[PDB]
């Protein structure tokens, strides 16, 4: 269907505990494929998905270099940041960076991203037009004048519109078996009496890829959304995902309820109910 490639960078300062920590990962849709950790024996860009490892030595060395450089450029970033907010050098602070592209099935840009957060809140972000910036406060505006002088936005547009998209096409192609073979969810319904008079019905969905999924409960053909509890979609540990939906029902009326599952890897949406034994 539609796809995206994202990078996520975390830079954490650590007072009296040496240089800061840098951990960044790369994702094509919901599949991690690359990692970099500055505390590893000898820091380098690493493969975290099968498909990405046939790539030649240049790819790896090039990215290792870009990660190594970042360690220094964002060392000063955390320095400057702590300066803009008149913060003690004894505290620990966090700089996060995310950027990437969204391509429709057709493979053309839907929108590019380049955002930053300091200590947990939006700091500065490139807008959808890819030519303007949105600063969270007057400190970020300092950054905004620096990058506007450097014609930074003009540089990112070249990457997001060029490099990002092309490497996304390439990746979705190399591992098209892992990346565009949608895994249908294994579903079932469980029953759990809360009391004498009330029972919980749990609609399960396991082993599905990608993460996007819709689980809804109905009392007769009628939706029950804020009668339904949903858990956050969680990783199974093997690249597939899991999720469940529960509703508390009056005992004896269990069969008035049905569960409806929607997922990309399914021919047609499923409809389940509880099996009395």
């Amino acid at each position: 269907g539609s796809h995206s490639m994202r990078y996520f960078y975390t830079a954490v300062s650590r007072p009296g505990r040496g240089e800061p920590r840098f951990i960044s990962v790369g994702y094509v849709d919901d599949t991690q494929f690359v990692r970099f950790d500055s505390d590893a024996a000898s820091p380098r860009e690493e493969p975290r998905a099968p498909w990405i490892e046939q790539e030649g030595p240049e790819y790896w060395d090039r990215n290792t270099q870009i990660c190594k450089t970042n360690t220094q450029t964002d060392r000063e970033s955390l320095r400057n940041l702590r300066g803009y907010y008149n913060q003690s050098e004894a505290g620990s602070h966090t700089l996060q960076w995310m950027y990437g592209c969204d391509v429709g099935p057709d493979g053309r840009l839907l929108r590019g991203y380049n955002q930053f957060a300091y200590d947990g809140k939006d700091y500065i972000a490139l807008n959808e037009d890819l030519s303007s910036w949105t600063a969270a406060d007057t400190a970020a505006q300092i950054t905004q004048r620096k990058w506007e002088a450097a014609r930074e936005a003009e540089q990112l547009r070249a990457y997001l519109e060029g490099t990002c998209v092309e490497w996304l096409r390439r990746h979705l192609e190399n591992g098209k078996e892992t990346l565009q073979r949608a895994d249908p969810p294994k579903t079932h319904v469980t029953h759990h009496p809360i009391s004498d008079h009330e029972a919980t019905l749990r609609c399960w969905a396991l082993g599905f890829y990608p993460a996007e999924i819709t689980l809804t409960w109905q009392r007769d053909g009628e939706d029950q959304t804020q009668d339904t509890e949903l858990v956050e979609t969680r990783p199974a540990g093997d690249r597939t995902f899991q999720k469940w939906a529960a509703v508390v029902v009056p005992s004896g009326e269990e069969q008035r309820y049905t569960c409806h599952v929607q997922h990309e890897g399914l021919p047609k949406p499923l409809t389940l109910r509880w099996e009395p034994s």
Binding site: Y7, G26, E45, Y59, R62, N63, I66, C67, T69, N70, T73, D74, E76, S77, N80, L81, L95, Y99, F116, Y123, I124, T143, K146, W147, A150, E152, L156, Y159, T163, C164, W167
Partner: peptide
């Protein structure tokens, strides 16, 4: 590939 950003914040 990743994006090389020489600019600091």
């Amino acid at each position: 590939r990743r994006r090389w950003r020489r600019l600091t914040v």
